[PDB]
């Protein structure tokens, strides 16, 4: 009884670690020819820190990442504080875990290192997947192939598993864009007094989220959401420039302007205008994360949902075993579709932490306390 996970992202590697720790025989196949530390920040709330606790990674992750005392929502133009969401020691006491902001590449690397060695394969690009009935044949672009009893679809937004299941999918134009940059140097130390640990700068049609990536506060990361022309480039990221960011964020608070001046290299990433409806499973194939329920990143919860899917899916396979995968896949959708729908409608309103609201329904969620029924 073997599980084949397609895709070694944050979601797939989390499923690999959790399912292997539960006793299952899991192998992962990643299309990237090598592993890359992404070189960006990521936010990890207490609800997912509890999943990292089950992997034995929470204590370690608390050592690298930055622990912001507050989430500040600030008006981009005036700098007025729209919300001051208490985290820090309050988050630990009220939600049972810490709210951390951390280097995504170092988290991604530590996650894959938690998988049993010799079971993660790079350069394995899935081209064809055939549900033979009793088993599934996976065909890779390098000519090699494998077989497993179930396949986990963790191939992200451009999931080949969703494609072979539902078809080519209609084209989605990219009308928005996301600038990203890591800031180190004396440019950070010169303005460190005005650089807050975790703050989102809002305006009328754009935003900039900024936070530190380590506990040492020696690295500062921002990620934006700006209207943009239709993305028709050969790559998933193009090099931006200070002139582009200055024009995009004209009128913003001097702190935001200082941030743009402090950069050395800025990359630009396209964002989809729309996403398809969730597809949880069909036959022996089961999906998680962006492959299952692609969403707008307005809530900074996508990867957290991918790991939550991995945790809930493991709880369901532990209850039924691979011999009864259909019941496991049904129990996994039934125990996740309401939470995923709630996150979907909040990113739809694009209002997450704009004003002073109670984030307990996200951070205080107990994935392991839920009854599967
Ligand atoms: C601007 C922005 C900011 C975000 N901020 C946050 C945040 O603060 N917090 C948060 O929790 N989430 C955040 N997210 C969401 C997060 O980036 C994604 O939701 C998350 O990466 C989804 O994980 P995944 O494993 O499902 O897919 P991915 O992370 O995309 O991983 C998929 C993997 O599968 C591989 N793959 C793809 N196709 C194949 C194939 N055919 N064969 C083999 N391998 C394949 C890919 O190479 C990749 O390694 C943000 C997203 C954006 C766009």
Curated annotation (Swiss-Prot):
Pathway: Cofactor degradation; nicotinate degradation
Signal peptide boundaries: 1-21
GO MF, one example: monooxygenase activity
TM ranges: none
InterPro entries: FAD-bd, FAD-dep_Monooxygenase_BioMet, FAD/NAD-bd_sf
Source organism superkingdom: Bacteria
Annotated EC: 1.14.13.114
Gene deletion effect: Cells show a complete conversion of nicotinate to 6-hydroxynicotinate.
Function: Flavin-dependent monooxygenase (FMO) that catalyzes the decarboxylative hydroxylation of 6-hydroxynicotinic acid (6-HNA) to 2,5-dihydroxypyridine (2,5-DHP) with concomitant oxidation of NADH, a step in the aerobic nicotinate degradation pathway.
Family named by the database record: Belongs to the 6-hydroxynicotinate 3-monooxygenase family.
Name listed for the protein in its UniProt record: 6-hydroxynicotinate 3-monooxygenase
Organism: Pseudomonas putida (strain ATCC 47054 / DSM 6125 / CFBP 8728 / NCIMB 11950 / KT2440)
Gene designation per UniProt: nicC
């Amino acid at each position: 009884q073997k599980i084949a996970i397609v895709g070694a992202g944050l979601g797939g590697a989390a499923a690999a670690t959790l399912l292997q720790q539960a006793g299952f025989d899991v192998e992962v196949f990643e299309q990237a020819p090598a592993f890359t530390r992404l070189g960006a920040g990521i936010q990890i709330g207490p609800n997912v820190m509890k999943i990292f606790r089950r992997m034995g990674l929470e204590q370690k992750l608390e050592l690298m990442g930055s622990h912001p005392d507050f989430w500040f929502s600030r008006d981009g133009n005036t700098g007025d504080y729209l919300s001051r969401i208490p985290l820090g020691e309050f988050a630990r006491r009220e939600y049972g875990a810490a709210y951390i902001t951390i280097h995504r590449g170092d988290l991604h690397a530590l996650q894959i290192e938690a998988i049993q060695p010799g079971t993660v394969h790079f350069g394995k690009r899935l081209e064809k997947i055939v549900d033979e009935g009793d088993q599934v044949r996976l065909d890779f672009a390098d000519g090699t192939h494998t077989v497993a009893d179930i396949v986990i679809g963790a191939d992200g937004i451009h999931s080949k598993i969703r494609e072979e299941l539902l078809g080519a999918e209609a084209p989605i134009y990219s009308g928005w864009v996301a600038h990203r940059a890591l800031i180190r140097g004396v440019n950070l130390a010169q303005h460190a007094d005005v650089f807050e640990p975790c703050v989102k700068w809002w305006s009328e049609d754009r935003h900039m989220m900024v936070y530190y990536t380590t506990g040492k506060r020696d690295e500062y990361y921002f990620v934006t959401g700006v209207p943009h022309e239709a993305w028709d480039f050969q790559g998933a990221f193009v090099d931006s420039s200070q002139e582009e960011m200055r024009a995009a964020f004209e009128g913003y608070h001097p702190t935001v302007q200082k941030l743009i001046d402090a950069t050395e290299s800025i990359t630009k990433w396209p964002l989809r205008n729309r996403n398809p409806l969730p597809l949880w499973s069909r036959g022996r194939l089961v999906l998680l994360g962006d492959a299952c329920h692609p969403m707008k990143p307005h809530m900074a919860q996508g990867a957290c949902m991918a790991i939550e899917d991995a945790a809930m899916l493991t709880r369901c396979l532990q209850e039924t075993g691979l011999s009864d995968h259909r019941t496991a896949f049904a129990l996994y959708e039934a125990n996740r579709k309401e939470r995923a729908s709630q996150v979907q409608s909040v990113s739809n309103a694009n209002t997450w932490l704009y004003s002073q609201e109670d984030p307990a329904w996200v951070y205080g969620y107990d994935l392991y306390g839920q009854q599967l029924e």
